[PDB]
Design a binder for this molecule. Structure first.
Ligand SMILES: */O=C1\[N]C([N])=NC2=C1N=[C]N2[C]1[C][C]([O])[C]([C]OP([O])(=O)OP([O])(=O)C(F)(F)P([O])([O])=O)O1
Ligand code: NA
Ligand code: NA
Length: 321
DNA sequence: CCGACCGCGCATCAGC
DNA sequence: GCTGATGCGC
DNA sequence: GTCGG
């Protein structure tokens, strides 16, 4: 939190690029930037200092200098008071409104949530569901509600076919104390890369125990919707839940992948070169000395995959970067 | 100077 | 009605 | 906006 005033400044700037300017790369520059700065362990004293870091450059080093000397960014203040632009930026928080719809809406004077409630005839399904839950969807998820949720997802999934195999990945599988959503990955033997309605029946069971309350999108391998835990007391906030059906020969590659960590899984691609392997969500192999990657291996355990790329076991629970 | 910067499932929209 | 494109979430 | 060829 040493340079929190700085990283907030860049995260603000990042959001406006994505949401108003629609400059996705500029958005990511500021993110990268606000990330490395959020790990620098000294109170940054100048833009020059900062520019020593990777992904801070000139325009940002001068935005820090102005920040450190005056406490503000004139472009930031001006944009915060700009009605059009602030309202665009805001609406995008509603799930299913990205930069495009938020722009369209603010053109026709729909600039607040209250306005979104006045005009359902204009929101697609996903966006209504987003509107309805806008508050809950910004809450985080205690680890203990996740285990309460995990115990439900595993119970029903098994109660529909004991030969299912399902894991809850994300920051929750890394031991963390809170989660944003819940990401479940699902497999069944009767379906490999060369291969029924395996995902639908799992969704239908969790609607039948009334665990899943809405659907944002559903297909034959991905489901994105809404769940909630039961209850005398106050009802729990409705949560985001995603279910992905993966093949068996690729499950543990995607489990590994979606478990992470983010900061970690990519460290194995600067290390998928000294052992020289192609590690993506599905497949894996060695590469050619001058080119093409081979024909993917077998996988059956998780860390069969760090065997193949010279590392020992690594349980998710005990490491980040 | 000058292009790269992640790419994949699903819902929904142009454009036939 | 079909298909390729674009928006969205992540 | 920053990096790297
Ligand atoms: O743009 C992305 N591209 C990509 N190939 N993968 C990806 C992108 N965003 C996220 N992800 C991966 C990694 C991530 O772990 C999962 C699911 O996204 P989620 O659930 O929103 O992130 P997370 O790690 O679980 C979290 F944000 F830390 P949470 O949910 O605990 O707050 O897919
Ligand atoms: Na730099
Ligand atoms: Na949104």
């Amino acid at each position: 939190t040493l340079n929190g005033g700085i990283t907030d400044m860049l995260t603000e700037l990042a959001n406006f690029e994505k949401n108003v300017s629609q400059a996705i790369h500029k958005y990511n520059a500021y993110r990268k930037a606000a990330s490395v700065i959020a790990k620098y362990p000294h109170k940054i004293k100048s833009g020059a200092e900062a520019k020593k870091l990777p992904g801070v450059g000139t325009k940002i080093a001068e935005k820090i200098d102005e920040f450190l000397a005056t406490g503000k960014l004139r472009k930031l203040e001006k944009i915060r008071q700009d009605d059009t632009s602030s309202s665009i930026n805001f609406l995008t928080r509603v799930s299913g409104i990205g930069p495009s719809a938020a722009r369209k809406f603010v053109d026709e004077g729909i600039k607040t949530l209250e306005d979104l409630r006045k005009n359902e005839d204009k929101l697609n399904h996903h966006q209504r569901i987003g509107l309805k839950y806008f508050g809950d969807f910004e809450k985080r998820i205690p680890r203990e509600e996740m285990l309460q949720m995990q115990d439900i997802v595993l119970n029903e999934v098994k109660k529909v076919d004991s030969e299912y195999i399902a894991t809850v990945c994300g920051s929750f599988r890394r031991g963390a104390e809170s989660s944003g959503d819940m990401d479940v990955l699902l497999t069944h033997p009767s379906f490999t890369s060369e291969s029924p309605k395996l995902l639908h029946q799992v969704v239908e069971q969790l609607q039948k125990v009334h665990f899943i309350t809405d659907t944002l999108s559903k297909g034959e391998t991905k489901f994105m919707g809404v769940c909630q835990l039961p209850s005398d007391e106050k009802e729990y906030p409705h949560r985001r839940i995603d279910i992905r059906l993966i093949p068996k020969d690729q499950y543990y590659c995607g489990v590994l992948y979606f478990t992470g960590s983010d900061i970690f899984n990519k460290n194995m691609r600067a290390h998928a070169l000294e052992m020289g392997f192609t590690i993506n969500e599905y497949t894996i192999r060695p590469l050619g000395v001058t080119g093409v990657a081979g024909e993917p291996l077998p996988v059956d355990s998780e860390k069969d995959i760090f065997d193949y790329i010279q590392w020992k076991y690594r349980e998710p629970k005990d490491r980040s970067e």
